[PDB]
Structures are given as structure tokens and as C-alpha cells.
Design a protein around this ligand. Structure first.
Ligand SMILES: [Pb+2]
Ligand SMILES: [Pb+2]
Ligand SMILES: [Pb+2]
Ligand SMILES: [Pb+2]
Ligand SMILES: [Pb+2]
Ligand SMILES: [Pb+2]
Lengths: 64, 64, 64
């Protein structure tokens, strides 16, 4: 009755098959990678318009 | 005369080309990942019918 | 005015978009992997003809 078992159990038959654990691990990994990358971007895009201009980029670099 | 050189040497010409080392490293990696994942599954599937029901899943989690 | 911002800024509009940072990180990663692999090959291919014969392969292995 936890959303996690249901999230992994994609065809909803009450059983987590191997393919499902595998698809899950894959997408969980993909998501953590997206989140770290976005967070890094947003962190460089100091003013938040959604693009990094040469200035934001300049600050970001150096002794970093 | 070791099975390993022959395993990497896929077109069998006595020479391991770069593509072959590369294909080999790729598939070796893929296999270690499958094996760890399967072992983890089999380890959760406490009764071995090949699917994880909410119970096996429940035990598995917690302070894990 | 650094080649790096221009290298990431693929469509050249002065702005590094997210897709571009992402494509960049991907290809940077791909390249480091190629370079390490090639260096390892070249390191096994002791005489440099571009293929590893059973002999070069033999030396390479052991207590390695
Ligand atoms: Pb299922
Ligand atoms: Pb900006
Ligand atoms: Pb060959
Ligand atoms: Pb089971
Ligand atoms: Pb751009
Ligand atoms: Pb050689």
C-alpha cells in the first residue's frame, strides 16, 4: 500500500518483475543525473532567465 | 591459446583490434551490472518464484 | 571571448542553453573515456602496428 511498490510495479499486477526493477533503477538514475545537472545550471544562471551569458559563465570559472 | 584472447578477438584473425577491445570492455561492464542487479533481485525475492510481492518488498525496506 | 564558451554555445547565439550544457557534459565524458581507452590500448600494443597480438597481450597480463 506504499506508492513506491506501485511506482515500480508498472503493469500493476501486484508483482514487481525483474524488468520492472531494472527499468526503475534506470529511470531513478536518469533522474538523479538530471537533477544534479539542472541544479548546477540554475546555479550558474545567476539571474534566472534560463540561459547562461558570458558573464555568469565568467564568474563561475577561475579558482572556481 | 587462452580463451580470453579468443573471446576478445571476435573476428578471429589473431589480432585484437581497438573496436574489439572497446566492444569487450562495453559488454564486460554490461554483464557485471546485470549480475549485480540479478543478485539483488534474487536477494529480495526471498521465496524464488521470480517476482517480488509486497511482502518480500516490505521486509527488504526499513533500516534496510 | 574564450573558445570554451563558444565551444559549449553550439548554435552561436551568445547564450549557453541547458540542452547545450547537457550535450557538452555528455561529449566531454565520452571523450575522456575514449582517451583513457586508447591510451590503455596503445599501452598494450607495445610495438605500435595498431593491433594486439597474443604476445603483447600475454605480457600485459599476470600479476599485470
Ligand atoms: Pb508488475
Ligand atoms: Pb542568465
Ligand atoms: Pb581480431
Ligand atoms: Pb517472491
Ligand atoms: Pb546558444
Ligand atoms: Pb602489436
Amino acid at each position: 500500500a506504499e506508492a513506491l511498490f506501485k511506482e515500480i510495479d508498472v503493469n500493476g499486477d501486484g508483482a514487481v518483475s525483474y524488468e520492472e526493477v531494472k527499468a526503475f533503477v534506470s529511470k531513478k538514475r536518469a533522474i538523479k543525473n538530471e537533477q544534479l545537472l539542472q541544479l548546477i545550471f540554475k546555479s550558474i544562471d545567476a539571474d534566472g532567465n534560463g540561459e547562461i551569458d558570458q558573464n555568469e559563465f565568467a564568474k563561475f570559472y577561475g579558482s572556481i
